[PDB]
């Protein structure tokens, strides 16, 4: 192996090694400090007999003359095994649950490879999350990139954990896993997840990668890549249906912003890296499903919109990548709605592939369009009511406003520990459409109405 004792200079977190050969871009290294301590690092650029590296833990306390640098001859990898299920890891795949060590089947670059667009297979299958607002109006599809746009204080933690345990695939697939990824979150936030997973037995079905706020910024941006690499392994090599949840994606961008500045890279729009869109796409496009392969990867990235600004670089660029969005509003959180999902700005782009007979029952698409149209009219009539009093309303505007009320309190508000099957969701939807006269349900043909409408 290669062990070099010559370090030209150390500046900040960046280190310079001279008299080097056979070193590559993004190659991994190990620093043998004078006190025996071993710190990991990464090659940022290499030219001639010189290589510029960045240390994860930092360069603090290093004596150059008595420290050595070893080049491992491989990029940042992940030891994969089927025994990863039920286990808990850190941002770099190192175990954390203090259980037995894992002998990896093999090692994989966490960068992975890009799926051939030809070889791609359109999502086209339903996933039951349990949450009615999603499973019906903003359906999650196998291989879809469906994110959650939240805010500070908002119960996106409770929503993620709920989906993590409630989400299953119908058709009785004995193989369905959840890869939960935590990015730069506080200690207690991490404990919340790990405790809820164990007590609900969801840990036995999940693989967890936990990264903290005090953790190195590089570890924070490598955490989702460790998670996805496990997912792609479990799905494309072990044929499982893998659901990947990542949060907080805002912490990912702030870390990416820190590292960029650490490497003297010029800021882009609003201070965030000019390659932010591209960098996020290297994460979110890892999802999808491939032709001729059992198994798939579905992602649910959860982020907090800074000052609830959806035009902020983080939620905006995400929306330019993902196949929809689940919007949480504190206006509904104040109302106590659990989960506080506003179905008006929320959207799924591939839901039509997930609805319909065979995957769901036959009235899915019809009730979806009707529940939305009536709610939008109900909410609008409600707003027109408040500004002009309850006198300015028509006879139908009143029942429509009253409709939207039950829609938020009974339909959407289910509870963070209530699992509604898709059948229970759809049946409940009809009991709300019964509030409206049959003549108003223009979005539904009569054959469906004669069959399901009370």
């Amino acid at each position: 192996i290669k062990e070099y004792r010559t370090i030209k200079e150390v500046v900040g977190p960046l280190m310079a090694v001279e008299k080097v050969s056979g070193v590559k871009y993004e190659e991994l290294i190990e620093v043998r400090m004078q006190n025996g301590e071993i710190r990991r690092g990464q090659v940022l650029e290499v030219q001639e007999d010189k290589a510029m590296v960045q240390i994860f833990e930092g360069t603090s306390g290093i004596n150059l003359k008595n420290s050595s640098v070893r080049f491992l001859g491989h990029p940042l990898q992940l030891g994969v095994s089927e025994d990863m299920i039920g286990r808990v890891f850190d941002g770099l795949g190192r175990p954390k649950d203090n259980g037995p060590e894992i002998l990896p089947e093999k090692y994989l670059d966490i960068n992975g490879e890009v799926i051939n667009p030809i070889a791609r297979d359109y999502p086209d299958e339903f996933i039951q999350t349990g949450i009615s607002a999603i499973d019906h109006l903003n359906t999650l599809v196998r291989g879809q990139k469906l994110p959650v746009f939240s805010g500070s204080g908002l119960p996106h933690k409770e929503l993620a954990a709920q989906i993590a345990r409630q989400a299953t695939v119908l058709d009785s697939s004995d193989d369905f896993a959840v890869v939960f990824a935590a990015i730069g979150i506080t200690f207690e936030e991490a404990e919340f997840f790990m405790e809820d997973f164990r007590q609900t037995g969801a840990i036995d079905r999940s693989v967890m990668f936990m990264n903290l706020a005090n953790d190195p910024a590089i570890e924070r941006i490598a955490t989702p890549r460790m998670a996805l690499t496990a997912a792609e392994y479990l799905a494309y090599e072990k044929g499982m249906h893998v659901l990947v949840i990542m949060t907080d994606m805002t912490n990912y961008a702030e870390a990416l912003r820190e590292i960029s500045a650490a490497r003297r890279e010029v800021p882009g729009r609003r201070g965030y890296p000019g390659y932010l869109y591209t960098n996020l796409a290297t994460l979110f496009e890892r999802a999808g499903r491939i032709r001729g392969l059992k198994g798939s990867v579905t992602q649910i990235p959860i982020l907090t919109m800074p000052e609830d600004d959806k035009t902020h670089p983080i939620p905006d660029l995400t929306g330019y990548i993902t196949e929809g969005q689940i919007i949480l509003t504190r206006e509904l959180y104040k109302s106590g709605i659990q989960p506080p999902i506003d179905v008006l700005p929320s959207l799924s782009r591939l839901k039509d592939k997930g609805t319909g007979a065979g995957k769901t029952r036959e009235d899915h698409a019809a009730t979806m369009n009707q529940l939305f149209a009536a709610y939008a009219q109900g909410k609008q009539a409600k707003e027109l009511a408040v500004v002009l009093g309850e006198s300015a309303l028509s006879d139908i505007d009143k029942i429509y406003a009253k409709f939207a009320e039950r829609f938020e309190n009974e339909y959407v508000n289910q509870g963070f520990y209530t699992n509604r099957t898709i059948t229970e969701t759809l049946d409940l939807g009809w009991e709300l459409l019964a509030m409206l006269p049959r003549t108003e349900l223009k979005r539904i043909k009569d054959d469906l109405l004669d069959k399901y409408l009370p």
Partner: protein
Amino acid sequence: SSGSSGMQIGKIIKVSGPLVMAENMSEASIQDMCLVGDLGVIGEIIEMRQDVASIQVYEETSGIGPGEPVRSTGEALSVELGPGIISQMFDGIQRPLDTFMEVTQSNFLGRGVQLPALDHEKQWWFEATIEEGTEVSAGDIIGYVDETKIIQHKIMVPNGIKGTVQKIESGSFTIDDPICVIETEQGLKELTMMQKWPVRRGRPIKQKLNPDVPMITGQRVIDTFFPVTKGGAAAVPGPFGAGKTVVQHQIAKWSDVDLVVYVGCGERGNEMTDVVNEFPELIDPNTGESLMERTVLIANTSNMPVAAREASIYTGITIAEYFRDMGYDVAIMADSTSRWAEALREMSGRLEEMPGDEGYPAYLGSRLAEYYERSGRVIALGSDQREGSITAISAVSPSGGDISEPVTQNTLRVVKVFWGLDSSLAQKRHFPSINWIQSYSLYSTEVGRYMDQILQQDWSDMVTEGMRILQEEEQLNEIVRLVGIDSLSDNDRLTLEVAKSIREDYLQQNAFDDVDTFTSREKQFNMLKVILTFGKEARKALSLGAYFNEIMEGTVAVRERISRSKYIPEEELAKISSINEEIKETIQLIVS
């Protein structure tokens, strides 16, 4: 060296991201393509200091370092043009992803795998049409290959070739086989069915022409209010979820063009997979053949190598020029051009260049201006002086929807059509989300004349009146929100309900409805006339002294028929124009 001579081999001296520095490239030129590193990843030389070349790599460089060899190819970024290009999915640098898959035996895109764009093995039947001993210049046609039943692939004389046909004959050949011997001043030159061309240099033409013929997209809002001509260029700036991709898919599906070249520039991979699946299953009733037999797909997704985004843009437009020279009307879609500009900014920072606006390089506008200027109505080279055209549709993806973005602005300084998507409308489920107020087309005046002739109706004046109502609606609504609708005149309230009819019954158009996704030119006329005649009769009724509420309450029947009129089949247009009869007879009873 060691007793034997070989080609010059470079040596990597630096690697950082998509930028590789290599020494001993003395014989190489600028813009020349090269195979970088041990894997031989594709890369383009962009700069040169002494014998050191700065190389722009179109693939991932992770795992590459100094010491590795670099071999040049001699020629610049070029495309293979000939039989086997139609109904194909290419990446940024024109590699068949279909073939890419089978060769590597992998569902994933590796690197260091170079592949011929076209099938050199496949037998094509060439049919000569020119006579021997004929003075052929650059562009002159020598024969053809029926690549598809729909599209005829004409074999033209390559540029820089002028002489006399010596030996030509029909038969089954490959694109590597000589099919014609042209006797030039330099001697004898063999011509095959395939030619190549640098993507960065535009293909030569005789002269440009004014685009005066409007394109039929089947989208009511576009073809009527903000039309685009064949050879014109249109920009579609809008926030995410507004419908940039859907609009561009509609043009690819229904536009009256001979060929469609779709470019997936740094966007979603599923959006390209959606096309290669659905398009071969979309057959127009006349030909018997599918839509995939007129399209050429270029797909460099977002997670695909950033540098290859620019290549995808230049690859598609050059292919579009190739069939333009065949006298065909081509239409190219770029989705999105923003990702192209983002690619330029990435390589700019790596090259330590200076801004520039918003991080983008100073030469951004030029690259854009150079791009759109390659489209238009042209006269292709050759004695025929045949006419061809390229219509450029480009989706711009402004950050946060703000069209103050450099990419949107620079595009608007060279294109005459602007389809502005509104996020507010998209949330109201108002698709296409085109803002009818801010959007514009500088072709509308000329299109109106062409329309007035080909239909014998006053189309221009109908459109003018239609827009005039929509503008009053914007002003009236401001009066509404601070005074109240009840304070409006009955003539004003009529103007509102007519404007409402324009938005919901004409402008709103579902692309996913099997009958509403397309609306023929003649169908657009009837629909607009019906809507306009309702305003005229109601205006007359109000003049006679009728009340607004009476007219409205006594028109529930027709106004619903007007609403559902968009769903009336293309054969039963007589049902739409007959509403004029039912309208004129309904309001006269209201007066009485």
